[model samples]
Target: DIIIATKNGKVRGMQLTVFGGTVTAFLGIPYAQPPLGRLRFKKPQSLTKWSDIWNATKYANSCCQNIDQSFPGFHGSEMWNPNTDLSEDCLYLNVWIPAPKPKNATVLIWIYGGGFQTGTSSLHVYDGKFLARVERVIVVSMNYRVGALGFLALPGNPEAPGNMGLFDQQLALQWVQKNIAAFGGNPKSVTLFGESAGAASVSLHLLSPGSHSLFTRAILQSGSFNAPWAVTSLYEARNRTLNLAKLTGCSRENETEIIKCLRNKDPQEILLNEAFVVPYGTPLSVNFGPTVDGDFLTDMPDILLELGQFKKTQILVGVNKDEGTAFLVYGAPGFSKDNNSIITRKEFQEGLKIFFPGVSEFGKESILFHYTDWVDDQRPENYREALGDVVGDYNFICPALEFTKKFSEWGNNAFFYYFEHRSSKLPWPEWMGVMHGYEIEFVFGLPLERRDQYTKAEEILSRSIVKRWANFAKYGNPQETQNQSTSWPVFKSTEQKYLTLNTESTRIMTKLRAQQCRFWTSFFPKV
Candidate 1:
C-alpha cells in the first residue's frame, strides 16, 4: 500500500510487480493547472493546494495529438502515437517508488520523445516500475504538449514565444524537486533522461538557464541540439509559423494579429494543420518543437553550447546505429516493397535539397558523391544502405559526436556511447540495425514479451546498462556500477573515444566512423 502526501494534497497509488521486488506507482498527478481557454498559449500555471485526498491511479488524458497520419504509412511503428483520449488538461506526471520505499533514494525522471510532435508518458514503453525496483531509484515520467499547440510562436509576445511544452516539463521537474521527497525521493540527486526528441529536450535543459538548477545529471539518447530538427531558430520560426498560419487560414499579416486569430478559432480547425506538411518529394519538415525565443532561448543552441552558456552537469550521450532507417526505407505505401527501386537525378537532387536546406548545388553534389552508387553506377536502391547511412550520420550521428566532443572540452563530465543492437524475434529488417529508440526497451526492462528475444548476452548487457544508468544517478560517475569486473573510461581529450555498446560484446574506441564524421563536420559544418 502507498499513501503519500505532497505539497498539494494526499495521494494513494497502486502496487506494481517488478523484477523481484515491488513498486508503488502514482500514475498521474497534475503539477500545473489545465491549459485551456485564455491560458492556452501561456506557460503552465502552478497547481493550487488541494483540500481532499487525490486519486492518482489513472493515467492523465494525453495532450491533444493529431490523429491524422500524414505521409501515408510513413514513420514506422516506433513512433508511438498517443492512442489515449486527448485533453487540454494533460500536464500530469507519473511516479514509481520501490516498495518499502526509503527516503533519499535516487530519482530518475523520464521525458518521452516522438520527434517532439507525438508521445505520452501513458505508453507502456515508459513504465517505470521495473527500473525503479531493480535500481532502487524513484522513477518519474511526464507528459508534455505537442504539435502547434505546444510550440506555436509569435516572436515577441508574452502569451507565447514557443516552448510551452518545455516549460511544462520544467514545471514538472520543479514539482518533483519540491514534492518528490514525500514519495521517497532525493530531490538533490536527480537524473533527467530520454530518447529521440526527449533527449533533445534534456540537452536543451542543459543549455537552458531556466532548467540548470533542476537536475544534476542527464542521459541523452539518439538526440541533441545540433540535430537538424531539434531547434527552430528565430528566422526559421517566423518562416514555419507564417507558413502554418497560412495553411490554417489564420494568416493575418501581422504576427500578433495572427496569434489573436488563432486564439479565437476553434482548436479543431487548427489541429488539422497541426501535423507535418510532408508533400511528396520533400524531407519531413518538423514544425512543432522548442524554438529560439528571447525568453527561454536567447540564442541558437549551437551558439549557446559553444559560448559555455550551458550548465555544468554529468551527461551521458549516445546514438543508435540506424536513427534514419525509418525515414529512408519506411515511407508512403508500396515504397518499402521495392528493394530494387530506382530514382532519377531529379529525385536524388530534390531529396538532397529537402534534407539539407540552404545548401548550394556544389554542396549537394559533395553529399551525393559520398552516398551515391559508388559500386554500380545506375541502381540507387542497391545503394539504399548508403542512402540511410548518410542520413543517420548527418542528422544524428555526427551531430552527437560534435556535441559530445565539444561538451567534453568544456570540462563538464561527459560520457559517450554508440548503441548497436537488433533482434530477429521481432520482424524488424536485419538491415535496419538498431533503429531509433532501440535502446529504450532494454533500459526500461519492459513489454516483458520482448525479453524472450534477449539472448543471454543481451540480458547481461541490458542489466549492465541499467546498472550503469542507475549508478550514474546514484553517483555522478556511470562507471561505478560497483563492478571491478568492468570499466568505461571517460571520453578523454587525448582522443575522442566512446563506448560501442552491443549485447555480444562492448568496446571502447577512439575512432568511430571517423571518416564519415570528418566529412560531415567539414562538408556540412552546420550539422
Candidate 2:
C-alpha cells in the first residue's frame, strides 16, 4: 500500500517495475488549483484539501501551448515534443521513489525547458523510474504553463504582472518541501536540476529570495538566466501581451480589460497568436519569457550574478559541444537535411545579424573574423561549422562559462563540463556535433532502457552521468560518486577548469574557449 498523506489530500501511487527493480510512483499530483477562467494570467493558487483520496496512477495534463511538429524529419524536434494532452488546468507533478523507500534520501526535481514555450513533464524521455531505481534517489518533475498564457505581463494590473510560469515552478518546489518527507525524501537535500530554459529557471531560483530556501543545490545544463533571451523586461513583456491581445481581438487600451478579454479567448487562439510575437523559431526569439517583476526577479540577472546577491549553493553546470547547430534550422531556415545544405558566408553573416540583433556592423565583422577559420575561409565545410560555432558560443557555451566563473568567484563550489558526445541514434550529419538538449536523454537514463539503440560506450556514459548527477544531489559534489575514474575539478575564475564529458575520453580541461569567451564578456556589459 503506497498511500501517502499530503497537505492537499491522500494519494495512492502504484509500484513501477523497472529493469531490475520496482519503484513507487506517484503521478499527476496537483500542487495548485487549476488556473482557469479569471485565474488564467494570475499566479498559481494553493490547492485546497480534497475529501476524497486522489488517484496518482497516471501522468497529468501538460500546460496548454502550441505543439510544434514542424521539422518532422529532425530527430531532436520529434523526440522533445510532448506526448501528453495539453490543458489550462495543468499544474501537476510526478514523483518516483526507489523500491523499499528509505528515509532521508536525496531528492532530484527536474524542470523541463522548451525555450519557455513548450515542454511537458510527461515526455517519455523524462521518465524517472529508471533513474530512481538505479540511483536510489527520489525523482520528481512538474509541468508549468508556457508561451503567452504563462508569461503575458500587464504592468498596471496588480493581479497579473507576469512570470506565472516561474510561480508555478516555485509552488511545486514549495510543495516538495512540505510533502516530500512523507515519501521518504529529505526536504533539505533537494537538488533542483534542469536543461536549457529549465536550467535558466534553476539559475534564477538561485538568485531569487523567494526560491532561496527551497533547494540546497543546483545543476544548470546549457542555459543561464543571464542568457540574452532568458529574461525579458517588463516593458517588453507588456508590449508582447498587448500585441497578443490585438491579434486575438481583445481590448488593448486597459490592462485589466486586455486580460479579461484574453481570459475569454480560447487557449489555442492565444497560442496561435504567440507565433507572431516570436517569429524566429530559435531560442533567440523567446518573446514571452520570465521577466524582471521587481519581486520574483529583484534586479537584472547580470547585476545580481555579478554582485553575488544569490543564495550560496553547490552548482554543476555545462553546455553541449555544438549548442547552436539545431537552432540553424530555425534561424537559418534555408539550411536543411533534404538538400544537405552547406551554409554560405552570406547566410552566416545574416545569422550573425539575427544572433546579435543590436550589434553594429563593425562588431558583427569582428565576430565574423574571430569565428572564421583563416586557413580554409572559403571552403563550404568551414562555413557551416563556423556558423554553428558562432551561435554556440554566443548563446550556450559562453553564458554557461560566465555563470560558473561568477558562481565560483562568490565562494561556492561550482563544477563545469562540456558535453561533446553525439549519439548514434541521431540522424544528423557528423558536423552537427553534440547538439543542444542532446545530453538530457542521457541524464534521464534513456540509454539504459533502449540498450539495443545505443553503443556500450554510450551506456557507460549514461550510467556515469546518472551517478554523477545523483551523487551531486546527495553529497554536494559530483566526484563523490565513484563510477568514473577521473575527478571533476571545481571551477575557478583564474584556472577556469572544466570537465570534457564524452564516451571517448572523459578528462579535465582548463581555460575552455578563453579567447572566444573574452570577446563575448567584453560585449556582455553593454548589452
Candidate 3:
C-alpha cells in the first residue's frame, strides 16, 4: 500500500506482500538529486520536491562495480544478482518501520559493504522485517554513489568539492535527521551500523565533525580506523582518478569534458575497462577509496580516536576468524587445495614484511612464529587461515580493539566480539572456520531455510545471530541467551576481555589478544 504523506509531500511506502503483516517499507526512495550527467562528479544535490506519487516496491540498482565470476568464494551466489542496472542516478535509500505513528522508536540505519565500490540497500540478506517486528524499531538502509563517480576528487566540484560518496552518506543521514520522525523513529536515538567498507565509513563518520549530530551510536563489523589502508589523501585519489580517465581514453585536457561522456557510457563498460586497472588486488581498487579531504575529514580517524576527538558514543566492532581467506580463494593452487594446501615458512615471512613493513624484524619473527605455531598443521589451508587472521587482526580486529580501548578510556560504552560461525555453503573444508562476512546473514536475521542449499544447523545459527543483533539494537548490549547469561563484557584496558561467538558455544576470552597488535600500534603512534 502506498500513502502520500502530506507533511513532506512524499509517498511513503509499505511492502506487506514481501514480509506479510503490517511491515511498512519504502524501497528505492530518493534521498538526493539523481547524480547524473554534470552532477556525476559533484557533491550530491538536494532531492527537489516530487509531485508524482512514487512507487518504491523494488530496490534501486547498485552503483557501478566490477563482477568477476572466476573468483571461487568471491563470486557471491547467483541469487545475489550480477546483472542489476548501474547508474549515476543511484543516491537512494530504503526504510522499514513497524508503525508510522509509534513513539520513541530507536532508529537503526544500515550501510551496505562492497569494498567501497559496490553495494546496495536492496539485498535480501539485509532485510529488516525481523528487526522491525521483534524489536519494534525502525530500520533504514541507504545507497551512496560508489567508485569514481562517487569518490573521484576532481578539480572543481561545487556541492561537496571533495569525497562525493562520503558526502552522499552525510546527506542521507541529514535526511533521516530531518524526516525520520514522521516514520515513528527518533533521529536523536539513531545508530549507524555497517560491515567492511561500510564499517570503515562509520569509523570515518565517528571522526567527522559534520556527522556528529546524525548518529548517537555505531556498530562496525570487520573494519576499523587503525587499518593503514583506510584513509587516503585527496591529492592521491585525484591523481588516481586522472590515471583512470587516461586509461579509459579520456585525456587530461578534456578531464572536465569527460565527466558527461563517461556518464553517457554504459556502467558495465566503465566497470569492465577499469576493473583490472585497480592498484589493489582485492575486490575494490586500492586507488579508489575514502580520502582524507581536509573538509570532509579533519584528520585520520585513528589519530582522532586516540586523542579522544570523537563523540563519547556506544560502539561495537570486530572481525571474523578467516577474513583474508575469502580474498585468497581465487588465487594460487595452495589456496584452492584442501589438506595438501600449504604456504612455506619463507612465504609467511615475506607476507609479514609486505603487510607489516614498518614492524621490526624481531617483532615480525615473533608474530609469524606465534601465528604459524597456532595452526597444528602447516598445510596451505592452515597457513591461509593464519594469514587471514593476521590480516584480519592487524587490518581490522586490532584496530577495532584499539578504538574500543581508547573509547572505554573516555568512558563510552564499548563492546567487542569475534564472529566464528562457519557456513556449510562455503566451498572450503568445514574446518577452515568462519569466513569473512559470514556473520552478516545471521546478524541481519536472514532465515537459513531461505538460504539456498544450507544445512539446518546453519539456519539455527542464523536465527540465533539475528536475535543477538536485534537485541543489541534494542539495548546497547547483545544478549547471548534470553537471560543474558553470556553478557558481552566491555573491553577494558584492565580486563582485555571480548566475546567469541562460535558454533559450539559463545564465551568470553581474555588471553587471545595478539602481541603483533601491540607491535603495530607502536608503529602507527596515534596522533
Candidate 4:
C-alpha cells in the first residue's frame, strides 16, 4: 500500500506510526541527475526514467559544504549541520504522507536555510513526520547544491550561469508537479515555505518567471529576497569566484578555464578555499549565493519588489523578536568572546562600522543615534540589545516588512507575525531572547514529540502554529480552518497589521516596529 509509481519509477516508501497516525515516508528520492563530473557547475540535469523499483528509505548525502566550527560546543552550530555524509550526488528529496491520505491533500514543500552556503534537507529537526501526521497534509523537502558549487557565476559562460542551486530547486518543484499526485498530493495547491536563506529562496521564486506557476502560496520565516545577505551582486559574485579559483591554485585567467580547473579539483578543496574568500565584518554579506542572473532573476530583488514584478501569491512572512542575538554573539568578533559577555558602548559603535563598512561618519552617527538607547546607555545589556536591534532590523526585520508591504500594496493577500516567545528549553543566555530560528521547532511540531521537555502552553502553541500553517497551505488564509477565538488581520500598507505569536497571549497588533522599519527601508536608503 505504501508503494507509489512516480514518473521516474516505482518507489517503495517506509511506514511509521507517530503520535497522531501512521505515516508513510519516501526518503532520498532523486529529482535530478547527480551534479558530478562535467555537470559540476552546470544546471541540474533531469533524471532519466529508471527501470527498477527504487527503495526510498534512508536519507541521501548532503551537498558538500564546510561545517561551521566558529563557535564550538554551541547548540546552534551542531543543530544546523548536515546529519548525513557530504557529497556531490545530493539532489534528493523526502516526502511524508499520513495514513488515510486525504483526497487531493495539500502539499507543503520546505527549503532549508544555511545562508545559502551550508544546509541539508536531511537535518533531524526538519523531519516532516509530525507535521504530516498532525496536519494530514503532505510534507516534502529537498537537498540542493550549496557553497561555491551551487553559486559561482561567470558571466557569458553557458556552463556556469549563476543560481544553479535555485535551478535545482526549480527542478524539484517540476518533479513535484509531474509526480506528486501519485502520492495523493494536489500539485496545484503546493505551498513553498522556508527559513532564512531558504525563505529568501521562496521570495526569489516569487519574482522568477520559471517559478510562477509552481506554488500557490509561500511562507518566509525571518528572511526575504531583499535582505542584504540573501543575494550577491553579479560583479561581487564574479570576484569571489575568481578569488576562490586563485585560492585553490587554479588559473583564473580565463572564465572557461576556471570552470574546467575547478571541475577537476576535489570538491572539499573548493569548499575550503571558498571560506577564505568570504569577506568578514559584514556578518550578513554572503560571498557566493543567488545573483541577478538574466535567466533566473531578471533584475535586483529590491527593484523587482518595488516595481511589483513578482508573482501574486498568498504569503505569510514573519520574524522573531531578537533575530540577531545569535549572529552577533557567534559571528561578530567583538561579541564572540562569550555568550554572556556584555557589549560596551564603544563596542557598539565598532559593531556598526562592521555592519556599514563604507558609510560616512555622519551616516554612522545618524544610525547610532536612531538605534542607541540614550537613557539606558549605562547597562551593558541595553547596549547589547541596541546593537541586536540594529542587526535584526536592517537584515531580517525590515526586509520582511518591506516585502509584506509591497506584496499587500500590489493586491495580494499577505499575513505577517511577530514571534516573541523565548523558550526556556535553550541553554542560551536569557538576554538572547527569541533569537533567529527559535520559531522553527514550534512550526514543525517538535514540541509535541518531546512533551517532557516543553511546557503545556508551549505544546499548545506548537499545535496552534501547525494548524495555522497547514490552513494557510490549504485555503490561503491561516485562520480559515482554525476554531480559535483570536483573529488574524490581513496585512496592508495602510494598517500594517500583524499577529503577535507568543505563548502568553496571541493577538492582532499594528505597525510592529514601524519606526525602526521605516528608518531602514525608507529613511536610511537616502542617507
- Predicted candidate 3 versus true structure: per-residue lDDT over 1-527, tens digit per residue: 55645234576586553334466878877888787666766878786677878787778877766554563464343334334576667888888888544687888889877767677777777888767765677889888877666776654545325568888899999988988887788988888899888888888888889999999888999876556566556666666766666777765475556565565666666666555444435322344677767767777666687788986777887778767665544443345525634666666666665555556777777677667775356355555567667776666667777777877898877778888877666655554567667778777766544536866766666666666666676677766576345677877777878888766777888835557577556643432
Query: lDDT score of model 4?
Result: 0.86
TM-score of each: 0.91, 0.96, 0.86, 0.97
lDDT computed for candidate 1: 0.77
Local lDDT at 23 for model 2: 95
* Residue ranges of candidate 2 with Cα displaced over 4 Å: 278-283, 480-484, 524-527
Question: By lDDT, who's the top model here?
Answer: 4
* Deviating ranges (above 4 Å) for candidate 4: 279-281, 331-339, 450-452, 480-482
Q: Runs in model 1 with CA error above 4 Å?
A: 67-79, 253-255, 275-284, 330-354, 372-382, 447-453, 480-485
Error of 1 at 317 (Å): 0.6
Model 1 deviation from native, Cα RMSD in Å = 3.0
In order, candidate lDDTs are 0.77, 0.85, 0.70, 0.86
- Candidate 3: count of backbone clashes, pairs at least 3 residues apart or interchain: 3
Q: Which stretches of candidate 3 lie over 4 Å from their true place?
A: 2-8, 17-21, 72-83, 99-101, 155-160, 253-269, 276-284, 337-340, 346-370, 373-382, 427-431, 448-464, 523-527
Error of 4 at 514 (Å): 1.5
